[PDB]
Design a protein around this ligand. Sequence first.
Ligand SMILES: O=C(O)[C@H]1O[C@H](O[C@@H]2[C@H](O)[C@@H](O)[C@@H](O)O[C@@H]2C(=O)O)[C@H](O)[C@@H](O)[C@H]1O
Ligand code: NI
Ligand code: NI
Ligand code: NI
Ligand code: NI
Length: 571
Amino acid sequence: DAPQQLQVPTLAYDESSIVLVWKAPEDTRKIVDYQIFSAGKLLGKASDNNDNFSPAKPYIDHFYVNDKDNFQHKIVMQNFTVIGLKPETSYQFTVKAQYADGSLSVASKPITAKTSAKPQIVNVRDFGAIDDGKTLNTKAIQQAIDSCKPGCRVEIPAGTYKSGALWLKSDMTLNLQAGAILLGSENPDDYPAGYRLYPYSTIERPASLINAIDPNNSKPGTFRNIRITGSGVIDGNGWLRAKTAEITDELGRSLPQYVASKNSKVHEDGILAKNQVEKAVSDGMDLKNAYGQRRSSLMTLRGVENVYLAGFTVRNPAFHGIMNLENHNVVANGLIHQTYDANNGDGIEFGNSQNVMVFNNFFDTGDDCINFAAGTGEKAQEQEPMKGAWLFNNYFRMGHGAIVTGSHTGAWIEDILAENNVMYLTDIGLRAKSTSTIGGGARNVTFRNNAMRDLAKQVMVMTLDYADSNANIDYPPAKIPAQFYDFTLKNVTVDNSTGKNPSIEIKGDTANKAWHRLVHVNNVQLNNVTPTAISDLRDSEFNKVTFTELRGDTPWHFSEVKNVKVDGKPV
Ligand SMILES: O=C(O)[C@H]1O[C@H](O[C@@H]2[C@H](O)[C@@H](O)[C@@H](O)O[C@@H]2C(=O)O)[C@H](O)[C@@H](O)[C@H]1O
Ligand code: NI
Ligand code: NI
Ligand code: NI
Ligand code: NI
């Protein structure tokens, strides 16, 4: 049976290279690889291609080095990067599944894809940007982006260029080259007023280091075709290093460690974050709000139609990492997030966005690795639901949760597929959080074909915390309350969870009609984890969930359930 949906991810192409992706099926037990052909001639194998181009892949391979007795689910590759092409040329492509026994499947349906024309190179050094400093390069870099024809590529060569908020525009690529560091200014003045998160958000936030923000409007299409690429670094300049400032990782590579702070300690821990909180407070804000709203995130792209992020490293954000607000057709390919343990420094936020994709990423983050947000309370539907996410071939290291949906569940989070990922040391695999006042919820979320080791807290959580009035709400409360339903956990193995809360933990408020429903759990193996705690669940089943070395006497703990089923045999 042929591979489905070979495709080029949005803007995932160049004058000399094209990126291909495709669907792997639910059951990959017999598929050990995929092979890629242009005009019926072999280009190579997905596995070996990923060894060359994916930053996640050496980590994914090493993950299995420990794995005797073959306990861990073996993921398959779903991407292949075709390089060494010529400008403006059409190429045809097919993909075949390769099986354990050496045989291939029938070829996929073909795709034709054309490279782009060689772009107008614009170098920021030609506008007076210089690696020192203290040359603040905001003006040079902005000058370079301003002087940009549609289809340009702005280059930031090797060197450390301090800069304040920059403002991107449609039909461009910003390329950070090997050895380039875009360093955030620590001056709160270089980040002028930026955006409000939601239409009903009352506190204005400053600009991020990199922006695509229309001063008036969030509507998808406000910008179009924005690309940020290259193996260079974006450094937010937010925080001091931790007591132990660098660790050696499991591949023996060096990881930066950023201090873990709070609102009352930012005066000690921050750099950009110190200065922005101090400025906000002298201007009249209390600390709580100054810390929560007034630190610059690393990147905020809003209203963009077609985004492509690739190759770059993220370090040291003053607030959040990468933010996508009201975007369509976003792709994140092979980013390296090194922001542990920057307070609220999540890897990528997806907010009221549609059709998004993250693959080949390395995540080591101060907060959630991938977060999905859809607004909060009654006013939420003024905006699109967060609809359509595909998260594959990533390596999650530390962070508050690999896949997080999201607490902000207002306009609905939906159609989310997380497959063929590896998690090592992450807090949680799948984290679904809301309250009854936020409303909305998450639905049609699939978490499958993932392998996980040494989770710090839990395998899956779905909490729903009913409030209500009990009036403490910053937005209008929700009339129709929040709910999680239609969640699938399938073909997932966890070895070790070193926390103490339940391995699988579902909690609503059934007293107050707040329950989760339609949870389908199939073929999961959990070694050395605590027992489950599942309350307020309906119409759900748990089949072939095997607990070995359980840290407790019995795996299954059920209160307040209706119509579930273990194996399937019932309560
Ligand atoms: O307010 C924001 O900018 C964010 O709110 C929600 O995240 C909260 C934290 O800022 C986040 O880093 C982590 O601690 O979780 C929090 C929560 O969910 O309550 C959204 O989930 C974020 O995407 C963002 O909008
Ligand atoms: Ni090792
Ligand atoms: Ni640093
Ligand atoms: Ni953290
Ligand atoms: Ni948190």
